[model samples]
Target chain A: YKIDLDKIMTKMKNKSVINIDDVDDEELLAILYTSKQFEKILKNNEDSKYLENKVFCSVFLEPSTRTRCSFDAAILKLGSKVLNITDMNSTSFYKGETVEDAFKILSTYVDGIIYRDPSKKNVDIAVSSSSKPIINAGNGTGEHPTQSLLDFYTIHNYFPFILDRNINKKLNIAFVGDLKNGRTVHSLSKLLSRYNVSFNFVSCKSLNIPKDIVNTITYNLKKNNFYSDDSIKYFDNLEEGLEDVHIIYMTRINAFILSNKTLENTRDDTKILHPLPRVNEIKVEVDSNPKSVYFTQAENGLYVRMALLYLIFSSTSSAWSHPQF
Target chain B: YKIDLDKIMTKMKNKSVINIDDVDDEELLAILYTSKQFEKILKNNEDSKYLENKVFCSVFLEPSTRTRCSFDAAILKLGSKVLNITDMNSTSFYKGETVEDAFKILSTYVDGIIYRDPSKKNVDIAVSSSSKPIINAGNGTGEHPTQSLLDFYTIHNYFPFILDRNINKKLNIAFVGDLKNGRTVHSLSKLLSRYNVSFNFVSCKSLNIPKDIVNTITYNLKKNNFYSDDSIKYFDNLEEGLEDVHIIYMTRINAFILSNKTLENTRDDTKILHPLPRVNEIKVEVDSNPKSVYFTQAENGLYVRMALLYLIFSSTSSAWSHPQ
Candidate 1:
């Protein structure tokens, strides 16, 4: 699909994408389409000068390997500098300052901020206190807006037929793992609910998708005539969830919860995805199944993040506010 | 001062400056001179393209504020990207991987590495394991070569008279504070030894400069006819150390060691310097004094680190290495 640059520019200017619900369909498509362009640029090993001289700071209170690295890599690939503050516990400067104060001060130093905290409360504080745009990497169990965007991009890449609404097709996407704690799944469910997607939430009852989200999705999808109560189902076991699923979105699950039967049961065309740093959720045997797209999913994050930064920075006058230039 | 870029390139290419003693006087001057150029470039708010597409990683195991920021800033100013690993303790990838293996792996990813650790042994391991140049930010009680170089640069900036070897003038420089635990004082003392200078070591008996370094400095300065035993004096009080001193080098000290008399006693031109994150070693009153140059000292670190990165990356073949 070709990107309408003019459309993206008009819609995304001076905006903060804090929630999946906040990003409308065209805006979400704009992000995913722009990501496709960056994915190509990165594959060619070319650096884009779109964000030259702009500096971004990653203030991650939580420990992250992939998210932090990809964000930093994306910033660099866009010809920008990143000031990383990975260790807040050891930062002497944080001794007397509140998290709000820190975010406010950090706003003055960099054009944009990428923040992650163990709690969504600070995420709210960062959004309010920061003078510049704040990109949320993760916020407790609140939401990971970008993660959901990238996950959607990957799903679209593999199953582009889902875009052809004229066909009246229904796609089943399973969310298997600790759904209660996994913000990625929580956000992805909301993003997919807008599409004609049948949900398979496979988890222990203790870790099931919250009743509030399920109710909201059920009401909205029913109102749109996209699905009924029959379309959305839950399964305690992975075997039941895999039945007729087009996309199996996996998160960190108990090793015992996943068996070889689950992978064997999926449709041949079915794709498996994970918001990774996975711990024995899906076995290495599953990696060779040609359906494991988690690594590709992780790599897609770099492009998606690159696109996010491009859109955010392009919309802000501070993008051209490099004092030297 | 002018930079002999050609001369610097020939000597410093593909080399690591790990210690003050390892860097010969000419190489030292080359780094400092290059730093002066970068300082001017930075003052003009310009970024250099010399290290375009090159990536440098700062792997700081020891918690640092200024050192890490300045190094990252220097990397950016040179038109290069920086991969920072500040929280090694929390890195999931670091689990089960020895620091040596990590350094070896990191070497494959970047043009150069700027490393700091609590111990010098790991620094040694990093130098050997890393196929690329390893810059020692601070090693455990070991030499922080770049800090010494920047310290020397600040000393040169204010006291250019010391560079005039044609005149037989002796500048009295005092090293005050925890010289025993302070690697900065150790490295700076060795760096300052070459110049015609009288040294005043000020500290408690418990935290004096290690005797072995004092012996080496005294022996070398005497061998070069730069000084005798009398030129290097030890004082119990800051007041005594400040007497006739042209430069007062301070580090983290017990607050009670200093007094108003110490500041009043120094030569009017005496400049105070600290490798900072200074914890109440110097009073707030002292910061307002014209003699305080620690902030400028920290600022000079950016230019000096920029020059160091430029030299290291320019010399390496990997600077041009980027897989498409």
Candidate 2:
């Protein structure tokens, strides 16, 4: 199959995306950049005629308030309709229909699907089954590629110096809590590998980073220097890892996996980050701390998701003209 | 209770109803009458703005195409929103949340609920837990009150002379097949008692109507005249039963429950009616029979539901504006 960059770019202008691998890097970056521009438009309360008459179907098998609502708000801003299926008991799925069949039928009715199912395989099932593009909000413990993309985008926005791939600065990043099951860390680590960066795996032995992933990273980077320690002091004793580190990414432990006191320490300048729906891995006391970037990260999800929708659905040209609707 | 009749009537005007007992005879009659008017409105393709901004949450745990789509069409006709949860697996119930909690939370979001769950107790639980009105679409073996109401409305529409209670004429209604498990027949029997009507129950000996219902009917009518027989010849030799029978409510034998030969015979002017999703209660051969009122009964559901919604949401005075 011949890859038509132009046709692909045009179709990407107004579609809903569910996977990172669906679009090439050029189109992906274009979407992120357009999203940044759309952010300004939203902040100014500007009228966006880009998505009139368009409708989004958010079918979440799992309960979620933040991710679901933000997508609803984004679609509304774009002048589109949203149909939310937040409760499964109220749907026909209880009567023994498969998720693939549901999406197959829903695809005929809606323009896109913002699906968040507990099983990762369901996401792939939906992607394969849907004629319309699928946007994975959150799938099982597999990967939240969108969140990782937004985090990378947020870092790039804050410190423009990191956008320069040619820069030899090896940024130190600390990942706190249950690394074994941390999907955000797992995905972020992979995306960060695309840049010159050093990762710090900070967690208890039970929650240590998976050895297979460690071997994969070592093979990819050709240098293995991930600081492995359980000391709470490693967070406050940040002078060693904090020197010229552009971003300090902190995450809470998976509630189904670990306990609370595992993430008690803090650093002054190292921006404390967390991918939220936090189950007490990051202390509530840390909420007021200056270095806390978790809430900002959560808030950035809206902008990132909006940017993603804008990119996936908007025209390929750098300048995005609103759709005729 | 203070018996604030006017206040209750006002509250009933903009709601969706699932049971007859929920509204008094006056309000019930008013709704049925209004539904008669909606029949004409539907013919003309006119819209009703009685519930323009309001939304109906259709949460059917059981599969129902006729009833579900009827309510959906009614909500659309009212220029209201519809949150259709056609598949239950798309909800949190699969995650172990109770039906009551699901109703409680969903109640906060929508104006009313039209639900059909397998558990009868869940219906009562939802009605109590919900601040909004709850419409029990059907609760397994418990009651399908709306179907009964529509069935009665269709009966009255067909025989306009039966409108007055003082009319000495009595109609004979035959309920055939799985009478023990048919909620529609059970509820219809209760509603039919309000009128001067006799019942002829034709089913396999194993699927007879409960004695309690027969006793209740006997007490209400001050007469014990019900015919029961297990043979197909009972309907074929309907010289006695079919002579005065106006409606023949036929329920499927639920292949697992009875043999096919038992459901074969039908009387000429019997007006056969079956609450569908039929495996094979009324044979396909019965479809060509002019007496088959099943499809007509299914279509009448749309107007009946629309009328129910209009009556429940409109004020008592307004609901009575148009009478049968």
Candidate 3:
């Protein structure tokens, strides 16, 4: 129990998981540090009933196996209960009830909602109308901040060299497959740009990263007096971009997948990751490679979220000592 | 705890609940008795942590609002956890992963699985492949043993005299509506045949219970050394069949519903049962009748299934000298 209780108390003061950009460096650090702390406890199979009496709701207005089940799994392992409202047929939505109205009524019964709606406006309306903490599992093409958080955890996970004191040891990373429509890449690029990393925006010109976001990342890089004001590079294809990278975050779009042979040029130590249910994106053969961390990346989602949830639900602000390993 | 402990221990000793006909009279009696015990505990709003360290799966390859939610609710109420694999699109089955393969992989991470597949072969595959316990929630045209168990619970629930020596009173029951494809009727009738209940089959001749099953029920009644042997009567029409009936079990097919007028000859004291999401086989006005027990029948499924789950998972054989 001798951890930075004050930092944990302020960890999720926002009481919500929405856009990755909505959090400051201090808040993100708290989540990241706490995520590391939980990785050990879960690894040792130690039980922590920090959320014993709470009941959380995992509501999905869209279809998903991973997000819905993982969030429910996280709450269960925390020694709490989940009121799963996943099926659309059961939702009062069929009675012409508005999503906002549905969430307003729901907030009265549960401590929190892990919401996944295909509409961004509905997510915003849910956040504004609900009386309980709302974690945005995914809000359409808008933002999947939690996925980015776990993707970030995957990086500092296998390649801790990114955390070293040398700000100049640039973490060369490439985003393969969808860039324009993948919420994971869109949110993650924004977060990675905060640190010292050279990003290769690899995609067809039509699926290129938004110019405005690229310009914004450049501005933040320059304003912080960081490694390189120009933090991004562009590539038209995966092969041209895979060389000598430290991290390769793969994702798919519109029933598309990245090729395993495309990674022939990737650095030996380059860690490849994806937020999965891979519809042939990362080929199964590639899964045997030491570099493939996508499945483990998906598994990391449970612990990272358990830490985020613990911060959002727990409220102790006193002990400032280092956590026991 | 006056219930026989040794009998309850041997109940469901196979550790798998696949069909209604799999259980004998002794095991069925134990399950029925334990279900009554849970009914009392749940009525008092008591909490039982019999499955505290368990992580059970509720896997449904098809759509169901009642079966899916009720099983999850039962696990939560019993102080255990649930991993719900409900939606179809998220399943790797779309990616050519076999249903049996999916469940086998899942068994490594959970304690038990409540599997519902429309294919009977898949249910058998799941039972054989998994290392943990498998409870068949429902399988195609097979049988829903739990539904049958709860339906029996509902009858004994309202009419306790069926338990005493007045077994000779002969509960007059009628099975109305679709009987051929109705898995509920197929299972319930088999279990109901165990006691001193007389059955009146009233369905369109084509949709009547299969001749083989009806023959089996009749043979089981006559050959068994216990209970009354002559228990069945068939009427092709509802009005004549409903006349003076003590219990009416109604179900629907092809989106059809039975009207109250069809039961015009029903006695005032006739109680009704339906395994529901009932597409109006019973009239809405019938809901107000004191004999309407369908909704209560659905609620009884939670505690009944919970008792079965507890008896399967917990092994306090010595402490079970008496089950109060």
Candidate 4:
């Protein structure tokens, strides 16, 4: 494949991330690689503080603890300020103010917006109207690209060799719980389809992964070739799919509702992931299981987000060093 | 009473201050003296950075604008970070997650928790369960230690020498507005009782400082035999106590509930104080009054909180210095 460094640089320099659909496979890999570099610095016990004096406005309309805190911690760790909108009810939104209007006004107050709300069109509206970077933290049940980026980034940790190309029988992810409403799974399935990975779509009677998303994944698996002949299997019974997975991507749901084979039966190295604030759904014993990367995934949020902030504000090739300017 | 520096050092080092009751008079003065040092550095436009890399998680399970923001600003100025939980509604609490569980989980994540909730027992819960230091921001009808600390700190600004003694007939205070529900007033009254000052506890028929806090103040007044026989007077009306006060500590209530007193008649040198986000209880025109240090009181919250943070996390002998 021909790599156009100049074109990619131009896109990276002046772009607002509205969705995962906006990024190609190479760009996604670039961000993940960049995030890994940031993780290295953190591992070395260092402060990047690259975005000093830069401001990021976080306007999360929906109820959140982890995503909002992750963004806040990420921004602060990058040595930046945030105009946090934790009390959305107290603002002009109290009197029927549109999210677009809030973004427009908030654009004047800070450098970028980490927007999470219930509207799918919110990011699109911000991309068109707002004068600053609009990072879609989440928009309804539509897409959460940053989350999926971290999801894939977490997967990449175990399989250091796999980026764009998939290895046969090596990359399989079984998505469990609340499949119909789990935006994380939908976005991740699309992203992982770029690589060679079979998917086990796990759910109960009423909570299957959306048909259109699965259909699109099947079509992309056939067309992109990955660019790998990958196949997907459906699992109404989670126990049926439990034995053969490499990654178990769990979403939040009723703990008792999950009646499958004990995860103890799976591969000792099989990873379990959850975008959390999960109550007692996964027993405490499972958390002790070394294969559980949910907490690690949560912590990686800080590093992955620092990379996005650094990339968003730095020159495309500048690559985040202490600036003389 | 003897000032023991060595014992104070030990108490200062590892303390989970859930109330002003947790502080002795020496500790209070130490914090104020420490705050004065921070204030001097800030006057020179410098960051203390004493609490660098420290994380203070603010869990305000109540509605507020100034106190929480002041704490956030204070932590930031100390070169620290805050996980400010301003919206309490959007939490696992909605699903029956108690404050105990939240603070316990949060303890592993931060160095301390600045907890403010509607339940007075909330701070006690954190103190018992969490290993991290818990600073009670405010609990329902309970002490607001930082608010009262700033309140006392605000007064210490004018009477810098009044720390250990009463200036015989020099310092008198009037407590105003809804004393019953105002956590700030109740806390300040108990804290001020420690000093040599008269209290003109003002209230109407319904809203008054609870009887026990007043009786305690009255008892302390007679026992300490503070030089001027520092008095306690109750007022059913406003203008009656509107005289000869060095401090006028106001709390939030209906604005029209207070009568327009030409405060110029009072000691022209009186320093007015309020824990703010106050809407018109005292007119904005009064804020311009030099006596109006309420705005200054609000801003002092930043430095006072920094003093608390610094004292909590700093060396026993680390005094802040002014930049050249």
DockQ: which candidate is best?
1
Model 3 residue A126 CA deviation (Å) reads 18
Q: Output the worst ten-in-a-row residue range by lDDT, candidate 1 chain B.
A: B315-324
Error of 1 at B171 (Å): 2.5
lDDT per model vs. reference: 0.75, 0.62, 0.73, 0.71
Tens digits of per-residue lDDT, candidate 1, B1-324, equal 454556666667767667888787677776777788777755564545556788888888866655776687677767787777775532454577786798888899988888887777778888888999888887776778889988989999988767655337777899888889887888888877777778998888889899888977777677668876568899888767788888888876453344445688778888988876555677656756888887778778877887777766675434233111
Model 2, A1-325: lDDT tens digits are 1234345567675454554445455665665665676667767777764554455677777777788888888777776656666655324442444455445545544457788877777788788767677788887765666788778777766655444454455556777667788877877776665555667675666777777766555554544333223211233233343434546666555432221232333233456667777776656776766666777777777767776676565432343353211
Per-residue lDDT tens digits for candidate 4, residues B2-27, read 34544565577757777888888778
* Candidate 4, position A81, lDDT: 72
Segments of candidate 4 deviating more than 4 angstroms: A1-78, A81-83, A91-325, B1-7, B84-86, B89-105, B167-169, B227-230, B254-261, B315-324
Better candidate number, 1 or 4, judged by lDDT = 1
Tell me the lDDT of model 1 at A19.
Answer: 77
What are the clashing pairs of model 4? A224-A227, A225-A228
Q: Estimate candidate 2's alpha-carbon lDDT, on a 0 to 1 scale.
A: 0.62
Relative to the real complex, the DockQ score for model 1 comes to 0.08
Docking level for model 1: incorrect
Chain B TM-scores of the candidates: 0.90, 0.81, 0.88, 0.88
Arrange candidates by DockQ, highest first: which order? 1, 3, 2, 4
Best by lDDT: 1
Q: What DockQ class does candidate 2 belong to?
A: incorrect
Cα lDDT tens digits for candidate 3, B189-308: 777766666788888878888887786677655664333434677777776777767889987563235566665667777789987655447666776667787767877887788777
Q: Alpha carbon lDDT of residue A201, candidate 2?
A: 70
